[PDB]
Design a protein around this nucleic acid. Structure first.
Lengths: 172, 183
DNA sequence: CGTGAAATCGCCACGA
DNA sequence: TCGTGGCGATTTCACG
DNA sequence: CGTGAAATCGCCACGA
DNA sequence: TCGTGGCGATTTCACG
Protein backbone atom coordinates (compact mmCIF):
# COMPACT_ATOMS: atom_id res chain seq x y z
CA UNK A 1 0.00 0.00 0.00
CA UNK A 2 2.38 2.63 1.32
CA UNK A 3 4.93 0.95 -0.98
CA UNK A 4 3.30 1.72 -4.31
CA UNK A 5 2.53 5.23 -3.10
CA UNK A 6 6.25 5.21 -2.45
CA UNK A 7 7.61 4.11 -5.82
CA UNK A 8 5.10 6.57 -7.28
CA UNK A 9 6.46 9.46 -5.14
CA UNK A 10 9.99 8.19 -5.90
CA UNK A 11 9.74 9.10 -9.60
CA UNK A 12 8.87 12.61 -8.42
CA UNK A 13 12.04 12.71 -6.37
CA UNK A 14 13.97 12.32 -9.60
CA UNK A 15 11.49 14.63 -11.42
CA UNK A 16 13.27 17.35 -9.40
CA UNK A 17 10.51 17.79 -6.80
CA UNK A 18 11.30 18.31 -3.08
CA UNK A 19 9.33 16.25 -0.51
CA UNK A 20 7.70 19.50 0.44
CA UNK A 21 5.97 20.15 -2.90
CA UNK A 22 5.06 16.49 -3.32
CA UNK A 23 3.42 16.34 0.09
CA UNK A 24 1.33 19.05 -1.57
CA UNK A 25 1.31 17.67 -5.11
CA UNK A 26 -0.64 14.83 -3.46
CA UNK A 27 -2.33 16.48 -0.43
CA UNK A 28 -0.18 14.30 1.84
CA UNK A 29 1.72 14.93 5.09
CA UNK A 30 5.48 15.49 4.83
CA UNK A 31 6.00 12.85 7.46
CA UNK A 32 4.05 10.31 5.43
CA UNK A 33 6.36 11.48 2.68
CA UNK A 34 9.55 10.22 4.34
CA UNK A 35 7.60 7.19 5.54
CA UNK A 36 6.63 6.22 1.99
CA UNK A 37 10.01 7.05 0.46
CA UNK A 38 11.71 4.95 3.12
CA UNK A 39 9.37 1.99 2.49
CA UNK A 40 10.13 2.41 -1.21
CA UNK A 41 13.84 1.75 -0.72
CA UNK A 42 13.39 -1.74 0.79
CA UNK A 43 14.96 -4.66 -1.21
CA UNK A 44 12.58 -5.54 -4.08
CA UNK A 45 13.72 -9.17 -4.33
CA UNK A 46 12.31 -9.68 -0.85
CA UNK A 47 9.31 -7.43 -1.48
CA UNK A 48 8.40 -9.84 -4.22
CA UNK A 49 8.72 -12.86 -1.95
CA UNK A 50 5.58 -11.69 -0.19
CA UNK A 51 2.39 -12.99 -1.96
CA UNK A 52 0.00 -10.42 -0.48
CA UNK A 53 2.01 -7.21 -0.43
CA UNK A 54 -1.07 -5.45 0.96
CA UNK A 55 -0.65 -6.92 4.42
CA UNK A 56 2.86 -5.60 4.90
CA UNK A 57 3.20 -3.20 7.84
CA UNK A 58 5.34 -0.10 7.45
CA UNK A 59 7.42 -1.69 10.18
CA UNK A 60 7.78 -4.66 7.86
CA UNK A 61 9.20 -2.62 5.00
CA UNK A 62 11.40 -0.91 7.57
CA UNK A 63 12.66 -4.18 9.05
CA UNK A 64 13.21 -5.23 5.45
CA UNK A 65 15.41 -2.20 4.84
CA UNK A 66 17.34 -3.44 7.85
CA UNK A 67 17.64 -7.07 6.76
CA UNK A 68 19.09 -5.38 3.69
CA UNK A 69 21.80 -3.03 5.02
CA UNK A 70 23.12 -5.44 7.65
CA UNK A 71 23.53 -7.71 4.60
CA UNK A 72 25.30 -5.09 2.50
CA UNK A 73 22.50 -4.65 -0.09
CA UNK A 74 23.68 -6.43 -3.30
CA UNK A 75 21.61 -8.77 -5.52
CA UNK A 76 23.58 -12.02 -5.56
CA UNK A 77 23.72 -12.12 -1.76
CA UNK A 78 19.94 -11.75 -1.79
CA UNK A 79 19.42 -14.42 -4.43
CA UNK A 80 21.66 -16.43 -2.12
CA UNK A 81 19.13 -15.91 0.63
CA UNK A 82 16.03 -16.18 -1.63
CA UNK A 83 17.03 -19.79 -2.43
CA UNK A 84 18.31 -20.95 1.00
CA UNK A 85 14.68 -20.88 2.06
CA UNK A 86 12.76 -20.71 -1.21
CA UNK A 87 11.32 -24.22 -0.55
CA UNK A 88 9.84 -23.17 2.80
CA UNK A 89 8.35 -20.08 1.24
CA UNK A 90 6.45 -22.28 -1.25
CA UNK A 91 6.01 -24.82 1.53
CA UNK A 92 4.15 -22.32 3.70
CA UNK A 93 2.22 -20.96 0.70
CA UNK A 94 0.84 -24.48 0.51
CA UNK A 95 -0.51 -24.62 4.05
CA UNK A 96 -4.18 -23.67 4.07
CA UNK A 97 -5.09 -23.10 7.71
CA UNK A 98 -3.16 -19.95 8.76
CA UNK A 99 -4.50 -16.57 7.58
CA UNK A 100 -2.66 -14.36 5.12
CA UNK A 101 -1.33 -12.03 7.85
CA UNK A 102 0.11 -15.06 9.68
CA UNK A 103 1.81 -16.07 6.44
CA UNK A 104 3.73 -12.81 5.89
CA UNK A 105 4.62 -12.91 9.59
CA UNK A 106 6.08 -16.41 9.28
CA UNK A 107 7.75 -15.34 6.06
CA UNK A 108 9.20 -12.18 7.50
CA UNK A 109 10.64 -13.80 10.63
CA UNK A 110 12.14 -16.20 8.11
CA UNK A 111 13.88 -13.35 6.29
CA UNK A 112 15.39 -12.12 9.57
CA UNK A 113 16.57 -15.68 10.23
CA UNK A 114 18.92 -16.10 7.27
CA UNK A 115 19.99 -12.46 7.59
CA UNK A 116 21.53 -13.10 11.05
CA UNK A 117 23.44 -16.38 10.46
CA UNK A 118 24.59 -15.51 6.94
CA UNK A 119 26.08 -12.23 8.24
CA UNK A 120 27.75 -13.73 11.32
CA UNK A 121 32.35 -17.20 4.27
CA UNK A 122 30.09 -20.25 4.22
CA UNK A 123 28.80 -19.91 0.64
CA UNK A 124 27.81 -23.49 -0.32
CA UNK A 125 25.88 -25.13 -3.15
CA UNK A 126 24.13 -28.40 -2.47
CA UNK A 127 24.90 -29.83 -5.89
CA UNK A 128 22.71 -32.85 -5.23
CA UNK A 129 20.02 -34.06 -3.07
CA UNK A 130 19.91 -37.49 -1.58
CA UNK A 131 17.09 -38.78 0.57
CA UNK A 132 19.85 -39.91 2.97
CA UNK A 133 20.78 -37.73 5.93
CA UNK A 134 24.50 -38.38 5.80
CA UNK A 135 25.74 -38.39 2.20
CA UNK A 136 26.40 -35.35 0.15
CA UNK A 137 28.01 -33.44 -2.64
CA UNK A 138 28.67 -29.72 -2.34
CA UNK A 139 30.71 -26.90 -3.70
CA UNK A 140 32.07 -24.20 -1.51
CA UNK A 141 33.42 -20.77 -2.45
CA UNK A 142 35.31 -18.36 -0.24
CA UNK A 143 37.33 -15.36 -1.26
CA UNK A 144 39.79 -16.42 -3.94
CA UNK A 145 39.28 -20.15 -3.41
CA UNK A 146 36.74 -22.80 -4.18
CA UNK A 147 36.45 -26.41 -3.29
CA UNK A 148 34.14 -29.33 -3.86
CA UNK A 149 33.28 -31.80 -1.16
CA UNK A 150 31.48 -35.10 -1.43
CA UNK A 151 30.88 -37.71 1.10
CA UNK A 152 29.65 -41.33 1.02
CA UNK A 153 29.55 -41.95 -2.69
CA UNK A 154 30.68 -44.90 -4.78
CA UNK A 155 34.39 -45.52 -4.96
CA UNK A 156 33.90 -45.64 -8.70
CA UNK A 157 32.44 -42.19 -8.54
CA UNK A 158 35.31 -41.03 -6.53
CA UNK A 159 37.43 -42.74 -9.11
CA UNK A 160 35.72 -41.14 -12.06
CA UNK A 161 35.75 -37.85 -10.25
CA UNK A 162 39.50 -37.97 -9.59
CA UNK A 163 40.47 -38.94 -13.12
CA UNK A 164 38.65 -35.94 -14.56
CA UNK A 165 39.78 -33.02 -12.45
CA UNK A 166 43.29 -34.35 -12.87
CA UNK A 167 42.84 -33.71 -16.56
CA UNK A 168 41.24 -30.26 -16.65
CA UNK A 169 44.38 -29.19 -14.84
CA UNK A 170 46.64 -31.19 -17.12
CA UNK A 171 44.86 -29.16 -19.78
CA UNK A 172 47.26 -26.36 -18.72
CA UNK B 1 61.74 -86.32 37.03
CA UNK B 2 62.73 -83.60 34.46
CA UNK B 3 65.63 -81.09 34.00
CA UNK B 4 68.29 -79.14 31.94
CA UNK B 5 67.88 -77.62 28.50
CA UNK B 6 69.29 -75.46 25.72
CA UNK B 7 66.10 -74.55 23.94
CA UNK B 8 67.46 -71.23 25.11
CA UNK B 9 63.97 -70.15 26.14
CA UNK B 10 63.57 -72.86 28.78
CA UNK B 11 66.67 -71.85 30.69
CA UNK B 12 64.82 -68.63 31.17
CA UNK B 13 61.94 -70.23 33.08
CA UNK B 14 64.27 -71.68 35.73
CA UNK B 15 66.28 -68.50 36.01
CA UNK B 16 62.80 -66.92 36.17
CA UNK B 17 61.86 -69.14 39.07
CA UNK B 18 64.98 -67.90 40.78
CA UNK B 19 64.71 -64.27 39.71
CA UNK B 20 61.37 -64.30 41.51
CA UNK B 21 63.02 -65.26 44.81
CA UNK B 22 64.77 -61.89 44.70
CA UNK B 23 68.08 -62.87 43.11
CA UNK B 24 70.05 -60.41 41.03
CA UNK B 25 70.63 -61.82 37.60
CA UNK B 26 74.24 -60.85 38.31
CA UNK B 27 74.12 -63.38 41.14
CA UNK B 28 72.47 -65.85 38.88
CA UNK B 29 75.10 -65.45 36.21
CA UNK B 30 77.36 -67.00 38.88
CA UNK B 31 75.15 -69.30 40.94
CA UNK B 32 74.52 -71.11 37.64
CA UNK B 33 77.74 -69.93 36.01
CA UNK B 34 76.76 -67.88 32.96
CA UNK B 35 77.43 -64.39 31.44
CA UNK B 36 75.27 -61.56 32.73
CA UNK B 37 74.64 -60.67 29.12
CA UNK B 38 73.18 -64.03 28.18
CA UNK B 39 71.46 -64.35 31.53
CA UNK B 40 69.47 -61.36 30.31
CA UNK B 41 69.23 -62.71 26.79
CA UNK B 42 67.97 -65.83 28.41
CA UNK B 43 65.37 -64.10 30.56
CA UNK B 44 64.66 -61.83 27.61
CA UNK B 45 63.30 -64.86 25.66
CA UNK B 46 61.76 -66.54 28.65
CA UNK B 47 59.37 -63.59 28.42
CA UNK B 48 58.40 -64.09 24.81
CA UNK B 49 54.53 -64.13 24.61
CA UNK B 50 53.28 -67.70 25.29
CA UNK B 51 50.42 -67.35 22.81
CA UNK B 52 52.66 -66.06 19.99
CA UNK B 53 55.11 -68.68 21.13
CA UNK B 54 52.41 -71.14 20.03
CA UNK B 55 51.68 -70.15 16.43
CA UNK B 56 55.07 -71.67 15.75
CA UNK B 57 55.39 -75.37 14.90
CA UNK B 58 59.02 -76.03 15.81
CA UNK B 59 59.65 -73.44 18.50
CA UNK B 60 63.07 -75.02 18.34
CA UNK B 61 63.83 -73.35 15.06
CA UNK B 62 63.30 -70.02 16.75
CA UNK B 63 66.34 -67.77 16.84
CA UNK B 64 66.97 -65.38 19.74
CA UNK B 65 67.17 -62.52 17.29
CA UNK B 66 63.50 -63.44 16.62
CA UNK B 67 62.45 -64.10 20.16
CA UNK B 68 63.50 -60.51 20.80
CA UNK B 69 61.50 -59.22 17.84
CA UNK B 70 58.76 -61.27 19.46
CA UNK B 71 58.28 -60.06 23.05
CA UNK B 72 59.05 -56.88 21.22
CA UNK B 73 55.79 -57.63 19.52
CA UNK B 74 54.47 -58.95 22.80
CA UNK B 75 54.05 -55.60 24.49
CA UNK B 76 54.38 -53.24 21.48
CA UNK B 77 50.64 -53.80 21.31
CA UNK B 78 49.29 -53.02 24.79
CA UNK B 79 50.26 -56.57 25.80
CA UNK B 80 41.83 -59.37 23.20
CA UNK B 81 44.91 -58.02 21.45
CA UNK B 82 46.67 -61.39 21.19
CA UNK B 83 43.53 -63.35 20.39
CA UNK B 84 42.20 -61.21 17.51
CA UNK B 85 45.71 -61.19 16.01
CA UNK B 86 46.07 -64.97 16.28
CA UNK B 87 42.97 -64.77 14.09
CA UNK B 88 43.50 -62.28 11.26
CA UNK B 89 46.55 -64.44 10.44
CA UNK B 90 45.37 -67.94 11.48
CA UNK B 91 44.32 -68.62 7.89
CA UNK B 92 47.45 -67.49 6.01
CA UNK B 93 49.35 -68.93 8.95
CA UNK B 94 47.87 -72.38 8.56
CA UNK B 95 47.63 -71.66 4.80
CA UNK B 96 51.35 -72.19 5.03
CA UNK B 97 51.43 -75.50 6.94
CA UNK B 98 49.96 -76.91 3.76
CA UNK B 99 52.50 -75.89 1.14
CA UNK B 100 54.28 -79.21 0.61
CA UNK B 101 58.02 -78.44 0.54
CA UNK B 102 59.27 -76.11 3.27
CA UNK B 103 60.13 -77.00 6.88
CA UNK B 104 61.51 -74.93 9.77
CA UNK B 105 63.51 -72.71 7.38
CA UNK B 106 61.14 -70.26 5.70
CA UNK B 107 58.25 -71.01 7.97
CA UNK B 108 59.68 -68.59 10.52
CA UNK B 109 60.54 -65.82 8.03
CA UNK B 110 56.94 -65.85 6.83
CA UNK B 111 55.07 -66.79 9.99
CA UNK B 112 57.09 -64.07 11.61
CA UNK B 113 56.96 -61.54 8.80
CA UNK B 114 53.20 -61.94 9.29
CA UNK B 115 52.52 -62.11 12.99
CA UNK B 116 54.43 -58.84 13.41
CA UNK B 117 52.82 -57.23 10.32
CA UNK B 118 49.30 -58.22 11.28
CA UNK B 119 50.28 -57.16 14.77
CA UNK B 120 51.47 -53.68 13.86
CA UNK B 121 48.31 -52.81 12.08
CA UNK B 122 46.75 -52.74 15.55
CA UNK B 123 48.75 -50.53 17.98
CA UNK B 124 48.36 -47.30 15.93
CA UNK B 125 44.57 -47.56 15.34
CA UNK B 126 42.48 -38.43 9.96
CA UNK B 127 42.87 -36.19 6.88
CA UNK B 128 45.12 -37.06 3.95
CA UNK B 129 46.15 -34.10 1.81
CA UNK B 130 47.62 -34.66 -1.64
CA UNK B 131 48.72 -32.40 -4.43
CA UNK B 132 47.37 -32.28 -7.96
CA UNK B 133 49.36 -29.64 -9.79
CA UNK B 134 52.10 -28.07 -7.69
CA UNK B 135 52.26 -24.48 -8.94
CA UNK B 136 54.95 -21.85 -8.81
CA UNK B 137 52.82 -19.15 -7.21
CA UNK B 138 53.01 -18.51 -3.51
CA UNK B 139 49.66 -19.73 -2.27
CA UNK B 140 47.91 -20.94 -5.48
CA UNK B 141 47.11 -24.66 -5.28
CA UNK B 142 45.02 -27.71 -6.20
CA UNK B 143 44.71 -30.51 -3.65
CA UNK B 144 42.67 -33.56 -2.68
CA UNK B 145 42.01 -34.50 0.94
CA UNK B 146 40.46 -37.64 2.41
CA UNK B 147 39.63 -37.33 6.19
CA UNK B 148 37.41 -40.40 6.10
CA UNK B 149 34.75 -41.98 3.92
CA UNK B 150 34.48 -38.50 2.48
CA UNK B 151 36.65 -36.82 -0.05
CA UNK B 152 36.92 -33.33 -1.38
CA UNK B 153 38.87 -31.16 -3.79
CA UNK B 154 40.44 -27.90 -2.62
CA UNK B 155 41.55 -24.99 -4.84
CA UNK B 156 43.13 -21.58 -4.47
CA UNK B 157 43.20 -18.60 -6.87
CA UNK B 158 42.17 -19.88 -10.25
CA UNK B 159 40.89 -18.95 -13.69
CA UNK B 160 37.09 -18.68 -13.61
CA UNK B 161 37.38 -20.83 -16.74
CA UNK B 162 38.75 -23.66 -14.56
CA UNK B 163 35.84 -23.43 -12.14
CA UNK B 164 32.91 -23.47 -14.60
CA UNK B 165 34.76 -26.24 -16.40
CA UNK B 166 34.70 -28.41 -13.27
CA UNK B 167 31.43 -27.02 -11.98
CA UNK B 168 29.67 -28.14 -15.13
CA UNK B 169 31.88 -31.23 -15.48
CA UNK B 170 31.33 -32.36 -11.91
CA UNK B 171 27.62 -32.01 -12.57
CA UNK B 172 28.11 -33.84 -15.81
CA UNK B 173 29.61 -36.79 -13.91
CA UNK B 174 27.25 -36.66 -11.03
CA UNK B 175 24.21 -36.69 -13.36
CA UNK B 176 25.53 -39.88 -15.00
CA UNK B 177 24.50 -41.72 -11.92
CA UNK B 178 20.86 -42.51 -13.14
CA UNK B 179 18.05 -42.78 -15.81
CA UNK B 180 14.72 -44.63 -15.30
CA UNK B 181 12.33 -45.75 -18.14
CA UNK B 182 9.35 -47.05 -19.81
CA UNK B 183 5.83 -46.72 -21.42
C1' DC C 1 26.19 -22.81 30.80
C1' DG C 2 21.35 -26.20 29.09
C1' DT C 3 18.73 -27.08 24.85
C1' DG C 4 16.83 -29.47 20.94
C1' DA C 5 17.05 -30.15 15.89
C1' DA C 6 20.22 -30.90 12.34
C1' DA C 7 24.68 -32.61 10.52
C1' DT C 8 27.75 -36.02 11.75
C1' DC C 9 30.23 -39.89 13.37
C1' DG C 10 30.68 -45.08 14.63
C1' DC C 11 29.79 -49.38 14.29
C1' DC C 12 27.00 -53.29 13.00
C1' DA C 13 25.63 -56.35 8.95
C1' DC C 14 24.50 -58.19 4.85
C1' DG C 15 25.52 -59.10 -0.19
C1' DA C 16 29.74 -59.08 -4.42
C1' DT D 1 37.63 -59.32 3.24
C1' DC D 2 35.99 -54.91 1.15
C1' DG D 3 32.12 -51.60 0.03
C1' DT D 4 27.81 -49.69 1.06
C1' DG D 5 23.28 -48.68 3.29
C1' DG D 6 20.97 -48.17 7.91
C1' DC D 7 20.27 -46.58 12.29
C1' DG D 8 21.39 -45.21 16.79
C1' DA D 9 24.89 -42.18 19.40
C1' DT D 10 27.13 -38.04 19.53
C1' DT D 11 28.85 -33.61 18.12
C1' DT D 12 27.53 -28.87 16.00
C1' DC D 13 25.31 -24.80 16.25
C1' DA D 14 22.08 -20.99 16.84
C1' DC D 15 18.80 -19.90 20.74
C1' DG D 16 17.00 -18.39 24.78
C1' DC E 1 53.35 -18.76 26.91
C1' DG E 2 57.48 -17.55 23.56
C1' DT E 3 59.11 -18.19 18.28
C1' DG E 4 59.99 -18.77 13.23
C1' DA E 5 58.97 -20.94 8.96
C1' DA E 6 55.34 -21.90 6.05
C1' DA E 7 50.64 -21.44 4.77
C1' DT E 8 47.23 -17.30 4.17
C1' DC E 9 45.40 -12.98 3.84
C1' DG E 10 45.21 -7.67 2.67
C1' DC E 11 45.19 -4.84 -0.74
C1' DC E 12 47.33 -2.14 -4.51
C1' DA E 13 48.25 -2.46 -9.32
C1' DC E 14 48.38 -3.78 -13.94
C1' DG E 15 46.09 -5.15 -18.99
C1' DA E 16 41.03 -6.66 -21.71
C1' DT F 1 34.62 -2.34 -14.10
C1' DC F 2 36.27 -6.97 -13.43
C1' DG F 3 39.44 -10.87 -13.10
C1' DT F 4 44.57 -11.98 -12.02
C1' DG F 5 49.76 -12.36 -10.66
C1' DG F 6 52.67 -9.89 -6.88
C1' DC F 7 54.75 -9.07 -2.23
C1' DG F 8 54.37 -7.24 2.00
C1' DA F 9 51.73 -8.11 6.43
C1' DT F 10 49.99 -11.63 9.40
C1' DT F 11 48.01 -15.91 11.15
C1' DT F 12 48.92 -21.16 11.38
C1' DC F 13 51.15 -24.90 13.59
C1' DA F 14 54.19 -27.91 15.90
C1' DC F 15 57.91 -27.55 19.65
C1' DG F 16 61.26 -27.08 23.09
Amino acid sequence: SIREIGLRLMRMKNDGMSQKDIAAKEGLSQAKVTRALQAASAPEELVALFPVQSELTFSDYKTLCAVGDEMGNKNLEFDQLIQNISPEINDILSIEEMAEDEVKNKILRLITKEASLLTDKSVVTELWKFEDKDRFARKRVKGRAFSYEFNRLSKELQEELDRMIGHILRKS
